[PDB]
Write a protein that binds this ligand. Sequence first.
Ligand SMILES: [Mg+2]
Ligand SMILES: [Mg+2]
Ligand SMILES: [Mg+2]
Ligand SMILES: [Mg+2]
Ligand SMILES: [Mg+2]
Ligand SMILES: [Mg+2]
Ligand SMILES: [Mg+2]
Ligand SMILES: [Mg+2]
Ligand SMILES: [Mg+2]
Ligand SMILES: [Mg+2]
Ligand SMILES: [Mg+2]
Ligand SMILES: [Mg+2]
Ligand SMILES: [Mg+2]
Ligand SMILES: [Zn+2]
Lengths: 103, 100, 77, 39, 136, 135
Amino acid sequence: VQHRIRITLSSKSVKNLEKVCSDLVKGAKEKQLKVKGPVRMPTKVLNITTRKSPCGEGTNTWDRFEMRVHKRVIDLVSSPDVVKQITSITIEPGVEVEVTISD
Amino acid sequence: STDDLVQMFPARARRRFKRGLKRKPMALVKKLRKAKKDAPAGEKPEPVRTHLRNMIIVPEMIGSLIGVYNGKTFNQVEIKPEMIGHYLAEFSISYKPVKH
Amino acid sequence: GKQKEKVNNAVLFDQATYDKLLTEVPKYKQITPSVLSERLRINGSLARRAIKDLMERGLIRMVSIHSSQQIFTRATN
Amino acid sequence: SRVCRVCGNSHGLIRKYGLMCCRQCFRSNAKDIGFIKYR
Amino acid sequence: AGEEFQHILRVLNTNVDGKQKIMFALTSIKGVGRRFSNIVCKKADIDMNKRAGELSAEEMDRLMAVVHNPRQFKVPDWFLNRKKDYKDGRFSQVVSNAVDMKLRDDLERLKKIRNHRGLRHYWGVRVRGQHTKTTG
Amino acid sequence: TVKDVNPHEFVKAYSAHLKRSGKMELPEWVDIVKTARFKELPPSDADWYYIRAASMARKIYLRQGIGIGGFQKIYGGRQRNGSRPPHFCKSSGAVSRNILQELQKMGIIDVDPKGGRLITSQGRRDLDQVAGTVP
RNA sequence: GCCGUUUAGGCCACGGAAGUUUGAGGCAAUAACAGGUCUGUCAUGCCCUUAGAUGUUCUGGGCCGCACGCGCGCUACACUGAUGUAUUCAACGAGUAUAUAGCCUUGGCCGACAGGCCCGGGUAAUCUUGGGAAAUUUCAUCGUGAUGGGGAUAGAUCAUUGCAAUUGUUGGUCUUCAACGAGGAAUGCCUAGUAAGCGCGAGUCAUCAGCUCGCGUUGACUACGUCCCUGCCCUUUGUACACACCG
Ligand SMILES: [Mg+2]
Ligand SMILES: [Mg+2]
Ligand SMILES: [Mg+2]
Ligand SMILES: [Mg+2]
Ligand SMILES: [Mg+2]
Ligand SMILES: [Mg+2]
Ligand SMILES: [Mg+2]
Ligand SMILES: [Mg+2]
Ligand SMILES: [Mg+2]
Ligand SMILES: [Mg+2]
Ligand SMILES: [Mg+2]
Ligand SMILES: [Mg+2]
Ligand SMILES: [Mg+2]
Ligand SMILES: [Zn+2]
């Protein structure tokens, strides 16, 4: 009746992610569930360095572009329906919710 | 008996064969036999003017009059028994030696 | 000088360094490294780094060995 | 045999991460895609 | 003390130094590098910490025995500098004067061929594809 | 044990062990192979195989599950490309595999499930025995 | 604490992780340039062409050709070293259904290397990868010798990528062993984890990195000034300059 449910969240924005991440944890704290989280995984910075000029004249100057991607994990023990009851609240834009079942 | 020839050939040459020479060299090889048949008895055979420069010279080819194209001219070539293992490329210079 | 090309002259194994030369060479300061004497006594090394071993087998002069092929000497004490 | 998805040009192509844009179209659309100039 | 210590050795028309160690004295022969000289010093079973010149001649005869018959002392196929000859088909170890002899026979072949590399050799230009705006 | 002895004198002591401890086979190419693509000459010491063995059984004794494509990186190094910059090159896999196979054919190490190579109980035993005998 | 209208500030000092704005960047005014870009853009005015095409696509060649001058660089001229053992310490990143094993590839076997076959993991703090980097350290060999420094030029031969490797793609094996003896006049970058040394990643990419953009590792000499040279800002001054002293 109790599984091992892992919910993984990804985002480009720290705060919009952490709002939802805290909301899930507290929504599963009212049900006296075992919430082992949130676990923080190394920020992935996607980087592309590009020449500013379109024509290759002048000083060679570069601009470094970066996307920060953040990876949170929440652990739960429940049935998938109780969690689906919990992970049904209003989700901020840009947040990925990808609940699965670990072994 | 191509198989024991590939052993004689250098590594580039046998790797070329192991990849299965496609249609165009197969269309070119026939025309050498055809020219040899057309040639009068013990006479100079017809010129076989080719576009391909990446074909490798196989022992059958000895005796053909090939015209390997170098980009602008159809430069005629004659084959000797030492011409085995190279391409028809190295026999039509694509450039002109420089005199300043 | 040519003290690896000089490793096999008659002199080099007759008496040359076997107390015929290196009696004194350490003793100018009583103590001078064989690796120091490679140029003061112009004779260089490895006709000479294999004789500092022979004086060891012969019980004449103590040594230390380290990184850069540094070798040392002390005449008798 | 590999062009900019935005303009179909053949030079200065960015294939990293699966973008497949040329170095100028990527600059024009970098902010829209989400690439921020931090440092 | 090398009482018969030789300073010249005339091995194979190369005037070997008698003043050096063997594995670097025998490299003076045109066709033997440090690697092949090492293999010779091993298969003839020579103390390598021996100056060439302190040697005995019976050792020397074995040196020439291994160099003139590299295939015979089990020196492997890949080691030799004449793999799969084109004039004959053998795996040989060309030595001092035959290195130049064979080399000029190759470039002569390419010259008579009208090969690209033959003409590059004849013209004095570079033959291996390097750029030549500003090199030479 | 092995970590209380300097790893240079220990490898000297062990490579003298395998020598006078019975024998193992030795290929018929040991005197001719360079041990690395980037090397210039073969190993200078004729007794190098045993060194390479004694140095190498200490790798499995301090680690667990090391393949051959990891030993090649262990004993690889700097390759100079003449006029181009030097880079990192890996050594030859044939000697690396052969010494492990021989250690198997003496019972010092063994191949490991989950991949790799692991020190044996008896192979641990003799390594600490010889370690006990190093100054 | 001392100097200073004892203001704004400045120098010194205990403390402190830190006392140059703590270090390094990003961002960045008005006015301008006949600066570069019509070869990034189905961005664009006008002109030219528009079928026997300056359109498109195919095949082959060149863009790389070589008496020579120039610019950024890579390798060096050795012993504060080269070679061969032993020893072993990072960080930043990367991994398109990548066809039926496929991008990064562990593990096992064959092979001297190059490379190959098989069983597999990973869409990744999970597998490659604690990224087992080099310089460095260590013990030997060399011995002042264009030498075992240097590795150009070249022969033969093997393998790899790719539809195809020829004016050598690249990687291996043996052989060949050039100049180069620390560089004239000139000239560049640099003030602390900096210069310099060392290697690693990514971009390009089927294959090719001596480049560029990053990253760690080892880690100094000198100065803490000045306006002499090259310039820059503000004021006063002269002017027959205003396209402005290249007047
Ligand atoms: Mg270097
Ligand atoms: Mg600031
Ligand atoms: Mg434009
Ligand atoms: Mg074309
Ligand atoms: Mg530049
Ligand atoms: Mg060298
Ligand atoms: Mg070393
Ligand atoms: Mg290319
Ligand atoms: Mg790359
Ligand atoms: Mg470039
Ligand atoms: Mg006046
Ligand atoms: Mg006026
Ligand atoms: Mg004037
Ligand atoms: Zn574009």
